[model samples]
Target: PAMNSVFSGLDMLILLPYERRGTRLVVEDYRPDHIYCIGADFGKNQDYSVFSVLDLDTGAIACLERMNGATWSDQVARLKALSEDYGHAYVVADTWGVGDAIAEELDAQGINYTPLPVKSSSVKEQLISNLALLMEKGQVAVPNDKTILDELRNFRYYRTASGNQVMRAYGRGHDDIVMSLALAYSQYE
Candidate 1:
């Protein structure tokens, strides 16, 4: 395997050890009746809609969904179904691109969730940083899936001579899962 410069940025997210697989997990005793939270990333074009469910009580991932090319209606229904299945897990979704549009749809469909716009570098860092600390402190568990792991380990920092910064993972897939997880953890407040 001759690997050259794939881009280096594996600093934002800490390593996540694999447990059972499927849904690679770090937390083993996650229960269905526990307090759960959700993070949603609504993406299109070169991106995909990603949803993550975490058991707040256990700091473990309960379920994750990464879907692309699905209509908004279908995605909303899928999210609602997961919400209900997870005992009405608290939902926190990003109001970034198509922000208001998706928020309105969720509201009209009667799905309870908090809409947040992580546009500012400050907000994005805080959001992603929260999970980084959580992982560092063993307070969070991520899916052991290849996509999630690849994106997680690829998270890197970007800097300029002016000292401003932006965070982006190195991959063609994007950081949907990473952002989705952060949105879920935001509800811990």
Candidate 2:
């Protein structure tokens, strides 16, 4: 089947891989001329926070992290550590709600990040659709982790009353991982 047709048949869900391919690599070393774009989604209260890093050169996912019930300080420290470890790669985060405070903390630590607000449904749809296109074109590889797979598998969309497509997760599930992945991929283009 053609690449476009594979995803075109779905109502709104985009099916991503659940197993890591050979393209997946460890997050330790940094490659020259390769940007490690990191995306973060902040969680509030019982929600879960997710961070994803993509290597633009090879279209591989270098790292994926998730945290629940952790304080903002811890999350900030972890992000800072990841930045330092990855040679100060560009970081982009979903700066919505608690994300504002998270971005502020990151700045205080001298970890500069591009704030991407996911509050706009249209923008979110574009970002996610772009990521799906990249995946279909074999320009990106995702991790085989359950959380990431679950989020991507459950990600869906629907048309509004005015015929505008809005991206979202199925049922009451969370799409934090998928959102972070989309944010990371957005930095590639």
Candidate 3:
């Protein structure tokens, strides 16, 4: 089947790996040569709305901006404009995972996305184990800096696969609002 047709026929819910759990994802066209937003969802009542855009060629975060909202029409318009201005970059939301409502919205808007669904209960168990590593061996560690320490304490983790996990340190309860701030520090350091 043609890529477009195959994707079009898929129900938003069906695209998610874990159906019982809500999931949504968005994949933007690759764009190089412009500044894309990276960390502007820095305020309250707007955690998921913030994102950072990466330059495919340079592998650097070009910019940061707050997303408009979960509504499809609004996101589509906003992203379309942003892509045009920035040369075409993908917008990612909800590090925790995408929910069904947003998935439906993106589907309706015809926005390409990669929806990571809520994991099955068993996967959640693995996530706990992975998070334990964060605490036990510094797979995810708190920085020596006091501010980053406070932020790291509130960091959240998600199980990705056998050897991978996703960590988030920016959100409502986090001291540091920038997602990449902690990333500036590395484990080897």
RMSD of each: 4.8, 5.2, 16.2
lDDT of 1 at 169: 67
The candidate, 2 or 3, that scores higher on lDDT is: 2
Off by over 4 Å in 2: 1-28, 161-163
Model 2, 1-189: lDDT tens digits are 222222332233332343332323244356767778788887777787777777777767777677788798888787777666677877887777775577678778888688888878878877888888877666767655556666666677667899887767777988778787888889775
Arranged by lDDT, best first? 1, 2, 3
Which runs in model 1 stand beyond 4 Å of their true positions?
1-32, 171-173
Tens-place lDDT per residue, model 3, 105-162, is 5567664334322245444334334334333442332213333335434556545578
How do the candidates rank by TM-score, highest first? 2, 1, 3
- Superior by lDDT: candidate 1 or candidate 2: 1
Residue 118, candidate 1: alpha-carbon lDDT: 79
Scored by lDDT, model 2 comes in at: 0.70
lDDT of 1: 0.71
For candidate 3, the lDDT comes to 0.36
